[PDB]
Amino acid sequence: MHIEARLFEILTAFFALAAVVYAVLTAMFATGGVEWAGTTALVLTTGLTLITGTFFRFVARRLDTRPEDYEDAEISDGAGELGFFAPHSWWPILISLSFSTAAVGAALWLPWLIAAGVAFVITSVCGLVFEYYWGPEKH
Template sequence: MKIEARIFELLTAFFFLAGIVYTICTAFSSRGVEWAGVTGMFFSGGLTLIAGTYFRFVARRVEIRPEDYEDAEVEDGAGELGFFSPGSWWPIAIAAGAAMFAIGFATGNFWFAIFSALVIMGTAAGLVFEYHVGPEKH
């Protein structure tokens, strides 16, 4: 996880530095500062900062992976990678909620978009907790 954290931290530095340079360069134009680009640059830096911080915290808690070694071989990472649900219908429901949200937002029907956002949150919770029900529920 240290590799991923380092990548996102470098991206954070790049976006913030590019945002500062972009702000300075557009400030001297005839129209003034171009706020959409400046906002996009700094928000991108903030999002990469969030991801990098998450990976840095997770890297402290998990054991060292083969990807973290300089001299690791491909076969060092062999074995089980995790559990993936073979027959879950929740991703389809999440996609349907996302499509409904896009339609509601694009058409200006904000009540429908809010309802669709609630559908997305509910179906995402269903996906996360799909296998966390007690044995009496099966």
Template sequence: MKVEARVFDIVAIFGFVVATVYAVLTAQMTEDGIEPIGTVALLLTGGLALLVGSYFRFVARRIEPRPEDHEDAEISDGAGELGFFSPGSYWPVGIAAAASLTGVALAFWQPWLIIVGIVVLLITVAGLVFEYHTGPSH
């Protein structure tokens, strides 16, 4: 997870540097001063990348180092089972449709459709999460 944390930290630094350069250049080149929308968007991009990088750093301290975290790791060190992945599930299609429905409802501000979209979205997410749940094993 340390590699991923470094990547997001680099993106965060880049976002903050670009936001600063953008704010200075727009203040100098326009009569209106600093352009707020682009500056805020770049600052938020840096902030979100910093948030994700901090999460990865937090998780990296609590788990065993992976082969990706070692400088001298070989490809064969990462061999083995990575987990269970569904061979064919239709739940992601339902989630996408429900998210699209909710997005359209928000765009046209239809409160009843927003509620329907959120309910369908929650149902499809629960379906994906519990697709292979077999219940407690006693």
């Protein structure tokens, strides 16, 4: 993919420019020196876009043309078998209930509720991860 990488490179360039400009303009001309709270956010949003763009760049350099990236193409090119898309599942609502229990137990300071919520989150996430890998029962 060539255009996504270019988008992220544009964003990273602008963010780095803005971060450096803000840092050096608040080093002077400011009440107490460098501002130290917007500077950090700016360098690390630059780092975010940089990470994403670099990953996309490597994947693009390690890839041959794709029917999506390619113009000139027809629908007989993508004829094949896509991945695995999960049909019906009921684990998400249980995960959300467990996380909400832990959150309300953290709002009102109740340690037992926090412990129960964490245990339920571990259980529900385990159920979600193993859903399509449990084998038949051994009897």
